[PDB]
Amino acid sequence: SFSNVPAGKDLPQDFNVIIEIPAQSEPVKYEADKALGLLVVDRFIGTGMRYPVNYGFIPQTLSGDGDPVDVLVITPFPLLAGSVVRARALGMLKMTDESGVDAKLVAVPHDKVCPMTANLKSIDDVPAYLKDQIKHFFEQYKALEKGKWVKVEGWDGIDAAHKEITDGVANFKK
């Protein structure tokens, strides 16, 4: 299932995201297991906080933290866990956590998939309230898990996101 999904049709700008956690879903963290082909319950979020947007990853990538590149996907309705969406980048949230330096990409679907998000051209177009909610979420969601912490550094743009994707694809292939 998940192991054979291509990273993208035209990398780094046209990529695929496998959704693990739908926007506003009950506060349970799922992770795709490529060895099993199934979603695995990773943990119940200690704070009970919910992801404000859909969350997943780009298959066939390997980031600096040893996991695939993570992506937040903004949509008008939450997406199905375990589904795949063709996406494009808006920017990224830069942070550091227990696993090391971490970044989360921010994306929306391909314009033909989601005409509703077509006017979001970069992270600057995302409403301030939603960016603030995403930052707050990452700063606070691990507050009740011992030995885990998150410091948010700031936002970066589409170019930074593309570098993350290209690096991830290359790292995966050895």
Under the rule (CB under 8 A), what is the footprint of a second copy?
A: 1-2, 4-5, 18, 24, 26-28, 30, 33, 35-44, 46-50, 52, 75-86, 109, 112-116, 119, 127, 129-130, 132-133, 136-137, 140, 143-144
Write out the binding residues for K ion, residues 6-25 only, by CB under 5 A: 10
- Shorter beta-carbon distance to a second copy: residue 1 or 13: 1
Q: How far is the CB of 117 from a second copy (least distance, A)?
A: 9
Alpha carbons 71 and 92: distance in angstroms, whole number: 8
Tell me the longest C-alpha to C-alpha distance in the chain: 43
DSSP per-residue letters across 69-86: PEEEE--SSPPPTT-EEE
- Binding residues for Na ion, per CB under 5 A? 65, 67, 70
- Binding residues for K ion, per CB under 5 A? 10
